[model samples]
Target: KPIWQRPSKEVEDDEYKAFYKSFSKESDDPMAYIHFTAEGEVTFKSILFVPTSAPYIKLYVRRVFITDDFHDMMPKYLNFVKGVVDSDDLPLNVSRETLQQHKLLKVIRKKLVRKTLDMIKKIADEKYNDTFWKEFGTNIKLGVIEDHSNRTRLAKLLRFQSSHHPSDITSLDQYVERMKEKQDKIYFMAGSSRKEAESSPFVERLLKKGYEVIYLTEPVDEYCIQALPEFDGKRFQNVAKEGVKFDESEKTKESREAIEKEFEPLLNWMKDKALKDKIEKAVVSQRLTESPCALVASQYGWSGNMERIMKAQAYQTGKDISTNYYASQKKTFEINPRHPLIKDMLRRVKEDEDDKTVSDLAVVLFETATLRSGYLLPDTKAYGDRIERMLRLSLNIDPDAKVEEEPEEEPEE
Candidate 1:
């Protein structure tokens, strides 16, 4: 007897468990299950199960066992669901294989996916955070990327670590509710870990200003966020890229412009002379409060996390044209006007255009900013040599000084 034929209210927990084990051939109890009958265009009595692993949702027509090999029964992201969908309304004339592609099956599939998501959404908060997420969190993230129609729904289900609370995970709704007044975009920084994302130079000002930022610690998080155009009308802002803006008054804007004018000589020198080949241009920064400088990508270019992922792929399968193009794009160099180091550099550059010390300082700052901004240095040895030169200058040693030679080793007879 098909367990789904019985009214859902009459089905005992043990009976549902027994049916799920017998149908899916698993000894353990299902994580969750849904039993219902479709009413209008496609009448079907179905029972769906969220198994402990990848699902194999079966199909039956008029209680006759049909193929269990159909792949379209659930979206790839929801492949962890297993159960039987028995429909009398589906055509009996068509072969099971052909019926898998039938139009009615499509309708059934749509309902199943909707019901599955609802079941997931209804999972108790404690169980969801501790178990469901532990088991299928990645699948849900992938769903957010692939299911454009259900993105908003999936966006609500997202959980990530944020700067607001060190240990607790937050949903987008929570982050949005807690957003500072006048804050427009939802801020996030993606990296391999919570520590890395939170400590990024890009988030320094935002965090210092008491704005909350979501920490995307998973590799798939960036891709997932990219898929979502907006959540609750708030667009996502990648802190590591070029779109970050603070609420500025007219006075603040004028002050920033004035500072830019004051630093024009050094900024022009950095762009035209010192880091011409390394960066697109040098500009006075509004984003920095603690850091002396940071390398910022263009709005269209890859962030540090994205660049790292792309480079890893390139090494694994050799670079494609697209990969090479993105990797070759230069980033803007943004300098803090308030930092003492930047102030000193500006003064030195204004005093002596030919000063080698100031030029070396500029190069070193660019390289350090490159690393701090989540980029790997192309020539670490060259950067090391520059650091050594700076150290020698600070110590008042000759610029051309060489390491002392050790005495020749005594040879045995």
Candidate 2:
């Protein structure tokens, strides 16, 4: 007998436990389960089980097993769920293929998804973080990417690495609740790891300004957040991109404009001469604090994490014209007005824009920013040569210095 067929409170916990073990063929107890008699559109009694160790669904018509394997029950993301739907009202009329097309099944699928999420939401915080989220977090993220209709619901279920705590994970709901009063955007930095995301120069000003930044560390995390442009009416701002803004006084703005005027000579020199053709443009930055400069992608361009993913792809299907386009997309070079290096650079450029040393400093700064911004160096050899040249000058060595040849071995040896 199906335990799901009985009323919710009528079934004992032990019964459900035994049934789950028998059904999933796993000895461990499932993390969470839900029993609901979905009514209104199509009445059905279904109990869905979230597997402790997780794949997927069964459908019964009038308590008779009609479909043992439903490859498309709710959505691909919920394939990790173990469930059975026994419906008396669902018509199993005609061929199984035709039954798959039944309109009522669509309603049932929707209900199952909704109720399934409800069960997950009710999971104990510890159980969720320790059991459910650790395993199924990726699936939830995948749903956020593909399940468009249930996006809001899925967003609530989403758990991610956060700047709030290093060892803890937070939900979008939690993050939004903790948002600052003046902050209008949900800040996030997507990277290969939590440390990478947190330490990025892109996030320097944001973290200092006391905005809660979410760290998206997994491969799927960025795509998941990208699907939902906004959560709770607050838009998402990718720290690695060019949209970072700060609210400052007019006096400060005027001083910034003053510095801009001072550095216009340096800025145009870098844009038009030094890093010309290698970047979209060079501008003074409001975001950078510690770093000399950072390479920021356009709003639509691929992020550093995303670009890494594209390059890290194991296999290409060939004919990658689109890949080339984003890969070749030039980023804006943002130099910090406060940094000593940039200030000194501005002074040098002001004195002489065509000086070889100043031009070399400009290219070296750009390349360092490129490396620091998470993009792979296009000409590492040139960067290495420049570094070597600088070391020679710093150490009072000739610019033409070459590695010494090993001494000839003694004939006796």
RMSD of each: 2.8, 3.0
lDDT of 2 by residue, 1-413 (tens): 56887789899988887888886575878887888897786788888888777545778898888866778897888888887888888666668888888888787788888888989989988778888888888899999998898899888888887788877988888998998877788889999888888889998887787778899889988888999977889899898897877767899889988988888888888879988898888899888779889999999898888888877772364455444877778999898989888888888877777898888878888888888898988888989988987987888766763432222334447
For each candidate in the order shown, give its overall lDDT on alpha carbons. 0.84, 0.83
User: For model 1, how does the per-residue alpha-carbon lDDT over 1-413 read when each residue is reduced to its tens digit?
Assistant: 56889998998999988988886565888888888887888888888887766547777788888788887889989877888888898888777677777777678888888888888888878877777876888999999998887888888888888898888888888889998889989999999888888777888888888898899988899999989899998999999889988777999888988988999999889888887787898888877889999988988789999998877877788656454676778899998889999999999899998798788778898898899999878899999988877787778776554432222233431
Question: What would the TM-scores of all predictions be?
Answer: 0.92, 0.92
Provide the lowest-lDDT 10-residue window in model 1: 404-413
Poorest lDDT segment (10 consecutive residues) of candidate 2: 401-410
**Distance (Å) between predicted and true CA of 152, model 1?**
1.1
lDDT of 2 at 402: 46
Error of 2 at 183 (Å): 0.9
The residue pairs found clashing in candidate 2 are none
lDDT of 1: 0.84
